[PDB]
Amino acid sequence: GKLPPGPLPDFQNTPYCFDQLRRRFGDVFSLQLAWTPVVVLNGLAAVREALVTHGEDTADRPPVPITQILGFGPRSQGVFLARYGPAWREQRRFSVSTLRNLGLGKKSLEQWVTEEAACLCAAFANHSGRPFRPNGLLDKAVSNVIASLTCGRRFEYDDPRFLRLLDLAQEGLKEESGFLREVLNAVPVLLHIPALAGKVLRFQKAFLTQLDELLTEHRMTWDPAQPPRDLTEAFLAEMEKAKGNPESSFNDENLRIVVADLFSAGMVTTSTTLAWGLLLMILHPDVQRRVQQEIDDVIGQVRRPEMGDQAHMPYTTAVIHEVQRFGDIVPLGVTHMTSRDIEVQGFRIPKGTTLITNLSSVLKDEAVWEKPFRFHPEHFLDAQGHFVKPEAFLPFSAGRRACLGEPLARMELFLFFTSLLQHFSFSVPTGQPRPSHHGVFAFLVSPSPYELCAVPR
Numbered sequence: 195g196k197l198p199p200g201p202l203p204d205f206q207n208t209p210y211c212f213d214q215l216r217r218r219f220g221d222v223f224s225l226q227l228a229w230t231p232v233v234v235l236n237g238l239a240a241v242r243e244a245l246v247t248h249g250e251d252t253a254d255r256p257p258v259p260i261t262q263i264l265g266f267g268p269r270s271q272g273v274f275l276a277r278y279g280p281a282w283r284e285q286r287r288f289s290v291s292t293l294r295n296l297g298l299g300k301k302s303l304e305q306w307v308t309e310e311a312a313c314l315c316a317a318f319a320n321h322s323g324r325p326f327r328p329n330g331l332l333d334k335a336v337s338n339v340i341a342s343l344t345c346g347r348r349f350e351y352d353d354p355r356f357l358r359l360l361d362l363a364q365e366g367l368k369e370e371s372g373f374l375r376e377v378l379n380a381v382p383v384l385l386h387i388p389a390l391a392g393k394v395l396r397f398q399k400a401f402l403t404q405l406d407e408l409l410t411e412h413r414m415t416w417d418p419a420q421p422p423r424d425l426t427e428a429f430l431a432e433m434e435k436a437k438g439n440p441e442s443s444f445n446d447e448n449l450r451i452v453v454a455d456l457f458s459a460g461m462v463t464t465s466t467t468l469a470w471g472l473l474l475m476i477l478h479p480d481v482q483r484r485v486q487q488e489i490d491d492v493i494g495q496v497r498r499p500e501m502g503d504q505a506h507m508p509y510t511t512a513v514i515h516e517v518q519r520f521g522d523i524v525p526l527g528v529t530h531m532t533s534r535d536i537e538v539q540g541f542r543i544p545k546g547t548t549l550i551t552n553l554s555s556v557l558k559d560e561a562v563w564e565k566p567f568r569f570h571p572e573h574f575l576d577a578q579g580h581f582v583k584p585e586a587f588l589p590f591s592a593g594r595r596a597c598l599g600e601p602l603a604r605m606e607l608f609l610f611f612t613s614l615l616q617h618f619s620f621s622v623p624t625g626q627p628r629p630s631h632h633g634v635f636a637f638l639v640s641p642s643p644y645e646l647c648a649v650p651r
């Protein structure tokens with residue numbers, strides 16, 4: 195019956211504000227947000243006990259009433275915010291299998307991705323030696339991979355339509371984390387204001403409208419006499435089989451949501467990580483070199499990198515993992531909700547509690563890591579040079595709801611990162627201030643804006 199302690203009754207600096215209460219109230223503390231009961235879980239032990247040991251009872255999401263404006267319904271919840279049940283599980287399993295069939299785990303996708311990587315290197319080379327922000331090109335190359343798997347196509351980097359889409363996307367994930375958002379969610383009555391309605395999800399509504407245009411084009415070009423060559427076709431073919439089934443989540447309202455969930459995560463998570471990687475590589479030249487040495491030793495500058503190389507590349511694998519750990523791009527993951535009463539670290543957490551997993555607190559757990567607040571590839575290495583992955587490596591969270599795109603993310607990071615470091619040497623532009631290793635918090639945590647020089651080898 196013991197409830198977790200907490201203060202009794204910020205939105206842009208949420209991560210660090212929680213770290214404050216952690217040292218004060220402990221690793222499992224309660225907190226009051228509007229009318230909504232929230233419990234924050236900190237450190238591996240508490241997150242693991244919640245998401246794994248009590249996995250069945252914490253795999254639900256908080257109701258989010260605003261998503262009604264985006265056409266959400268019982269059988270239309272996408273994957274991310276989908277309530278725990280049939281609509282969630284059908285889409286979740288569909289995405290996981292469909293990715294696999296499309297070539298995830300095969301040289302098929304491997305060779306495609308490493309081809310977009312070549313497009314990325316040519317875009318970089320076109321800056322000659324001049325300083326530039328690598329973010330936009332990172333977003334394009336990484337969007338194309340997920341666009342290809344879901345939408346059956348890539349875009350040219352100079353494509354106007356593609357640019358409006360990446361912008362709407364970026365500006366939309368911003369709206370995922372808002373003060374007003376939490377307001378209309380704990381107070382669902384506010385949606386009844388048609389004037390106030392529009393402005394809530396300005397960009398997300400507009401992103402879905404742009405995605406609709408692409409999906410419509412895609413219905414026209416689809417050859418249903420052929421095995422589906424991407425996720426949208428596979429979805430469309432299920433949608434056909436389900437004509438007459440009001441229970442199926444394969445409906446038109448859910449196609450735009452599912453593809454929005456997958457496209458946006460497949461883009462903003464991975465490229466932001468890579469922006470982190472490139473920033474850490476110019477702040478730590480010694481590390482950048484030691485990676486390039488391994489690349490040469492194992493691959494040379496002849497052929498494109500392959501996933502078969504990662505096995506024999508423990509240092510590069512280390513660095514990439516440490517980028518994720520240090521970069522820490524999703525400090526608070528995605529909220530969960532208890533669907534049942536549970537006990538965590540000795541405290542009672544009632545059914546219906548909003549659970550926040552503090553992934554930052556696990557990734558930078560001072561008890562687990564040698565130098566939690568430093569960029570230290572040896573966190574994933576031993577004295578012998580072998581790669582080790584500590585249990586506290588949870589940038590993808592844990593449980594029934596853990597990132598379904600992790601295998602895609604891992605192959606993208608390895609191939610893009612190695613390809614870039616295989617062909618370029620990155621540096622802070624002479625005469626410019628040393629860039630902050632601190633990050634700026636949107637919904638995600640991104641590096642603070644920086645430029646670099648990229649000179650070929």
Ligand code: HEM
Nearest residue numbers: 273274459460463464527528590591595596597598599603
């Ligand atoms: C560096 C790359 C990535 C990181 C760090 C990351 C991290 C995460 C995190 C923290 C969650 C929340 C898990 C939870 O609810 O406890 C999640 C879930 C999810 N991710 Fe990822 N992710 C990455 C890449 C991707 C990719 C490439 C895709 C799509 C192909 C993707 C799609 C999803 C989806 C759909 C969910 C919701 C899972 C569910 O609700 O069952 N993510 N991810």
Ligand SMILES: COC(=O)C1=CO[C@@H](C)[C@H]2CN3CCc4c([nH]c5ccccc45)[C@@H]3C[C@H]12
Nearest residue numbers: 274362363366367398401451454455458459
């Ligand atoms: C730019 O806007 C979007 O991508 C979206 C629009 O409407 C709904 C379907 C939004 C639902 N939202 C659910 C949560 C979430 C999303 N993308 C992520 C990417 C990483 C982490 C979390 C998320 C998606 C983004 C979706």
Ligand SMILES: [Zn+2]
Nearest residue numbers: 345346424427
């Ligand atoms: Zn197609």
Ligand SMILES: [Zn+2]
Nearest residue numbers: 576578579580
């Ligand atoms: Zn060893």
